[PDB]
């Protein structure tokens, strides 16, 4: 589809059995989850942003369906205030910038 | 122009006479500055950010030329790492994510 930004580009997400709203955002490298109670192994990853900092803990391989394409990446699971889908699943969808 | 988003969205801005870089970012409502000049009068505005909250100044009418195209809108400047144009100014010059 084709978002006009005068809305905040918010988007229903499936990921490991529950359903929950994700903000596609192309200034995020990575993709940040919140309440999202994810199955398996997790590594650590120190991530940051404006304000600063954050503890979040690295899931890979994870399954996501990003309205109803389906895409394999890496989730932080965080005490995030809004979900994320950043560039590295956006680009796995096809999403691109238009102007 | 059409940007793909494995690299970061990453183009040049014209600012208050100033030359610099700012990055397209989807999910920021407000467009914030790195610490620069920028002459007149503000409004105190602090809004949240992923780790925290940041103290900005709302400045008004502001003109930005971002990537040739001309936008006239609100700037805050402040201490950000990097620095974002935000649906504020991307809804002006007419940008929308596809897939
Ligand atoms: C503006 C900027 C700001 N947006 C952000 O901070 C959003 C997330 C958010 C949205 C809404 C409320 C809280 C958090 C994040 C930004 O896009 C930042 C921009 C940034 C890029 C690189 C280095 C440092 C910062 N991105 C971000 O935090 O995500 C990564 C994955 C890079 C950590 C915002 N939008 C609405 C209110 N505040």
Redesign the pocket.
Known sequence: PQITLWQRPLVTIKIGGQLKEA?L?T??????VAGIELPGRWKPKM?????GFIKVRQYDQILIEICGHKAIGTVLVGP???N?I?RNLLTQIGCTLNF
Chains 1, 2 share one sequence.
């Open positions: 903000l955002d200034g995020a490298d990575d993709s940040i991530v940051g942003g404006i304000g995030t205030p809004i994320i950043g």
